[PDB]
Design a protein around this ligand. Structure first.
Ligand SMILES: O=C1CCC(=O)N1c1cc(Cl)cc(Cl)c1
Ligand SMILES: [Cl-]
Ligand SMILES: [Cl-]
Ligand code: NA
Lengths: 301, 306
C-alpha cells in the first residue's frame, strides 16, 4: 500500500544524455542510435532571440561548429538537419546504450517522467503532466534545455517531451521528439502567455479511486449525478470537462472498487463544495490531478 | 523556476538489482562486487515468519537453494551468511556494473530516493524522508522487499535503506544495508505499530525558503522569535525541536533570501497558529517536510551526477 508520485527509473535515459555546444551556448542532447536530438534554438545568438530565421542560421553552420560530448568523449558530427523545432545531429558513433525506444506525442492530462539535466549530466527525476493549457509545471534552471520527458512500457522508452523554454508565469513549454511544440508556443522570445489552466478532472477521479483502493472512503456520499450536471458544476471550479471517453476509461477502477463512475463524480462535486474540513486524501489537503487512470492501476495493482 | 519532489537519477542502482528466490518466495536483491544483499526473511515460510529462528532456518539451506537471476542470467551462489537482518549471498561473479558506493545509516529527517523493484526489475523511483518515528511513507506492493534507498554524492552512491515490511497503518519499515532496522521493529509476522509521528521542522523551514526562492512570499511577516519561544510552539504542534545546528544548516538560505531562520520561524509560528487562510505554498495546502536544506540548495542550484 501507499501512494506516491513515482517516476520511471531513469537509467535507460541517462545513458542517452549528451552535451551539445554551439557558439557560447551549451544545452543537452538526446543520443539515440547515431543521431543527437536537441532544441534548434542552440544555434541562436543573442541577436537572434526574437525573430530567428532558423533556416538562415543553420545553412551557415558546418558539422564542426557543433561540439557534442558524451561523458568525457567528443563525438564526431557528420551531418545535421532540422525537423520542425528540433535539430538532428548525425554522429559517427551509434550510442551503445540506446534502449528500445519510440517517439510518442501525448495529449493533455498524460503524465511522464522528466530527467532534468545540465551540461549533459542528469540532475534529478520527477513526474509531470501535460496541463490542459499545454504547459508543464516543471523544475528547470538555465541550462536545462534539451532535457526530456518519457514513459517506460516494459523495457521500451517512449520519449514524449523535450524542454525548450520557461514562460513568464514560471511554467514550461517544449516539443515532442519530432520537434512540434505542445500548445500554441514558438521558439522565439516574443511575448507569449499560457492560457488559464484548468484541473484535469479525469485524473482527480482516478486519484479518488486510488484513495478508495488504499482504504479511504470518508469523501463518498449517497448521491449520483448525470454527466451533464457534473460538468456544469465542475466547470464553475475551473475543472476540465469530463467526456464519455473519460467515463469509459474509468470503467476498470469503477469495477475494482464497486463505485460507479458517476457516483464518484458526485463525491467530487461535494468535495468541491465542502473542501476537506481538515481531512486529507492520500496525504494531500488538495485534490491531486497528476495521476492518470493508467498510473493508478499501475501503482495500486 | 519550479520546485518538484525530485529523486536522484536511478541508473547506477538499476544496474545492481537482481531477483532472489528461495523456495516459494521471490524478492529483490542488491548485487555489489561479488555479494547479493537481501532481507533475511526470504528464507521463511509463513509458519516460520510467526517466530523465526533465522540461524536455524539457514543451516538447512544450501547455496543452490538460492536462485539469483541478474537479467536473464543466473548467478551462481557460492556462500551465504547473515549480518543482522540482511542475508549476504556470495556469488561467483563480481557485478561489472558496481558503482562507487558506500553503506551509510541515515538519521530521521534525512531524505533519500527509493528504487521500487519487483522480480529484480526496477519499476519506479520516488523520494522519501526517514520519519521521526523511523518509518517511511513509501509505496510498495507484494514483491517489493529488497528494494533499496539511496543518495548520490558526487559519483558515489550511498545506500541507506532496504525494504523489509509494511506496518498496519500502511507505512513501511526496513533496515540499513548492514541489516540494522530503522525504528523499534523486528522481522517477524506480528503485532507492531508505528509510534506517533511528528513533523520535521528544519525541513518545513527549508521548503518555505524554496517557496520564497520561487516567488511565493505571502507568509512572510515582520516578526522574529527565539529558539526557546519557537520550540515551545513546535512542541505544542507535534513538530520536532529546532536546534542550533538546524539554524546553522539553514544559514545559506537565510543569507540568500534575506530571511533569518528565526524570522522564518515566526512565519511558521503564524502558519501553525492560524493556518493558510485558503492560500497555498508551492502548490500545497499542507506544510511539506520531506525536503532537507540540502535538497533545496541542490535543486535551486542544478547539481548533477554524471
Ligand atoms: O507482518 C507484519 C510485519 C509488519 C507488521 O506490522 N505486520 C502485520 C501487519 C498486519 Cl495489518 C497484520 C499482521 Cl498479523 C502483521
Ligand atoms: Cl496521451
Ligand atoms: Cl496538499
Ligand atoms: Na518574520
Amino acid at each position: 500500500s501507499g501512494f506516491r508520485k513515482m517516476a520511471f527509473p531513469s537509467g535507460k535515459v541517462e545513458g542517452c544524455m549528451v552535451q551539445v555546444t554551439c557558439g557560447t551556448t551549451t544545452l543537452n542532447g538526446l543520443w539515440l542510435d547515431d543521431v543527437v536530438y536537441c532544441p534548434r534554438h542552440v544555434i541562436c545568438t543573442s541577436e537572434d532571440m526574437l525573430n530567428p530565421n532558423y533556416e538562415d542560421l543553420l545553412i551557415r553552420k558546418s558539422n564542426h561548429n557543433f561540439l557534442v560530448q558524451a561523458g568525457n568523449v567528443q563525438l564526431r558530427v557528420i551531418g545535421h538537419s532540422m525537423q520542425n523545432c528540433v535539430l538532428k545531429l548525425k554522429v559517427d558513433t551509434a550510442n551503445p546504450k540506446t534502449p528500445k525506444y519510440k517517439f510518442v506525442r501525448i495529449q493533455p492530462g498524460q503524465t511522464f517522467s522528466v530527467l532534468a539535466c545540465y551540461n549533459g549530466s542528469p540532475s534529478g527525476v520527477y513526474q509531470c503532466a501535460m496541463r490542459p493549457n499545454f504547459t508543464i509545471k516543471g523544475s528547470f534552471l538555465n541550462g536545462s534545455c534539451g532535457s526530456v520527458g518519457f514513459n517506460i512500457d516494459y523495457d521500451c522508452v517512449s520519449f514524449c517531451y523535450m524542454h525548450h523554454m520557461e514562460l513568464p508565469t514560471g511554467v514550461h513549454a517544449g516539443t515532442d521528439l519530432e520537434g512540434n511544440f505542445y500548445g500554441p508556443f514558438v521558439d522565439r522570445q516574443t511575448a507569449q502567455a499560457a492560457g488559464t489552466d484548468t484541473t484535469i478532472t479525469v485524473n482527480v477521479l482516478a486519484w479518488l479511486y486510488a484513495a478508495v483502493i488504499n482504504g479511504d472512503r470518508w469523501f463518498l456520499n449517497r448521491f449520483t449525478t448525470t454527466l451533464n450536471d457534473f460538468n456544469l458544476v465542475a466547470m464553475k471550479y475551473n475543472y476540465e470537462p469530463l467526456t464519455q471517453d473519460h467515463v469509459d476509461i474509468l470503467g476498470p477502477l469503477s469495477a475494482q472498487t464497486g463505485i460507479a463512475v458517476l457516483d464518484m463524480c458526485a463525491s467530487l462535486k461535494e468535495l468541491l463544495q465542502n473542501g476537506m474540513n481538515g481531512r486529507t486524501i492520500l496525504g494531500s489537503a488538495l485534490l491531486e490531478d497528476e495521476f492518470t487512470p493508467f498510473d493508478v492501476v499501475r501503482q495500486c495493482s
